[PDB]
Amino acid sequence: DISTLPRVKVDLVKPPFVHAHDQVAKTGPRVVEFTMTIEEKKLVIDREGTEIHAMTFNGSVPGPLMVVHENDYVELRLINPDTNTLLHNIDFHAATGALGGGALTQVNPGEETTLRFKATKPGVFVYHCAPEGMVPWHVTSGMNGAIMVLPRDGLKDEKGQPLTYDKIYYVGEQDFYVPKDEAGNYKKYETPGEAYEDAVKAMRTLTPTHIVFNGAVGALTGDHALTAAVGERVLVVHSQANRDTRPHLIGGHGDYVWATGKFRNPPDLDQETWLIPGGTAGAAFYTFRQPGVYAYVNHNLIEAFELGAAGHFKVTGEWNDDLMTSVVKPASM
Template structure:
């Protein structure tokens, strides 16, 4: 029965692309998309290659902010379908890149080539692919990266735009939103070769970078109001699609699990450190606000070729987009990074903590009289 369901789902994906007028990617012998003549071949034969070690969010992989030469960045993403406890006693099947929702951050520079291997282990049930918003070409590379369970594929694309961009699975039809809101999304940061700049061309650098990926989950409930639990992602698909149609998420966590970056899991910084936060929203808008801090520099739409906005209190990250903000901490303490729809932040999980160490500055903030009984 399971194999019949999987075959039906995967067949529906192929039918979707056929109806949409796209030929699915095949072994054409030229490396291009089937049905199209190749005019220009790869131009980066002389570039050096590096292997980028993927790390789990909120961390960034090791990278250099300013470079003088372009390179080929080799990346490996392994798809994992896994059951996750997103809140105590509340479970869902997540579809993930490298086991996390969002998937790992990829970092390169404008003009680099990214050589990406996408692996779909035989233990998975579904066909997957990857649509990179940084990719120039039809369907964001989705047609070149379709892999059934037990397959892997390698593609290469040139980073032609500097900025922060979402990537996500997009296998066709209702599979697209179902996979995305099951956690199958991530982000890629393409830095300018000469680094980040303000509106006057002055260099902007950061000491540390963190990645936050907002998720909107739609867990179905039974007739008693309890969240349902399923034996596989396919078994819960129909109920989840019905819940998705309400456009009312049950959970809105940052980084896949409620509380993923709060309390003992808080992000770390020091007074005087400059932090860059890249924030992606694959399917639903958010309104980042750093309580007690600001966006000293904000690229709300993620385009590093545009001058950043400055001194922002709250900004927006559109659905299907990623943006970046930079702040230098001046006081120690616990800072909350939230989506400033505070219902979403406090009740639904759109919150992270940043624990900042260092010495206090009374010139910036001081309690003059401690709380006492009213006389």
């Protein structure tokens, strides 16, 4: 009887940050209540001022990461304000039935709905918008996120022993297909509907114009770099709703990687690079052993450094000359 389970409301936070949660469940199964508000908005995605009509869950690209435990119930209130112009819905890869929920959550502008599903499988999963006839357009306009379903006793290593993270970050990787004029300049549009016909032609080339973390070129660099300290254990959740990616931490590794994101499987160890298929979320665990700046990239290095799929870690602490040292600094022969 769901009527007799405890309920908790959770307010979501903007990526790359993640709302507070317990790794090991302290209570029994609960109904976890979330609310998301759909927002269609103009987004500037590169340093040149390229502007797109993004379609977002809660105003961010990606949508926020939701965290629950196995066999909790997720209750999502989904609001489509009448200032929006399009029909939207939501499809949880974590859920069983009704096209992930998409058949039960179609909301026109000015409508809302509340969906509930049981989180029967532990792992990280994608959620995305999926309205009939327009699925790729909404997803590649930024309307995707992820949900993490933790095992009730937390994460384990390949030998069944507990793994505990100190920090968790969520990196949503987005491929964008911005229509171009005949000379190669990106087009601007007044409304989302105006862009549709050009957007379809652009999608059909299968060649993204931009591939970004957290909605924009450089969004996770500079003052917005991810931070950690030597000795800290960091979980990085990475999702790609449409296109394969291959994350790599430059100067580090994935000590424990669930590349396809499902926690009943044992992790891969010591990865340099791992493949997250389009339509999947993965998770990688690393313990920092050296301070300094790290780059986190899609290791198709064109996609990373030309199209935008690169971010930074800033890590503090003491340098370890046992692991690495410059014996002879660069000098003339």
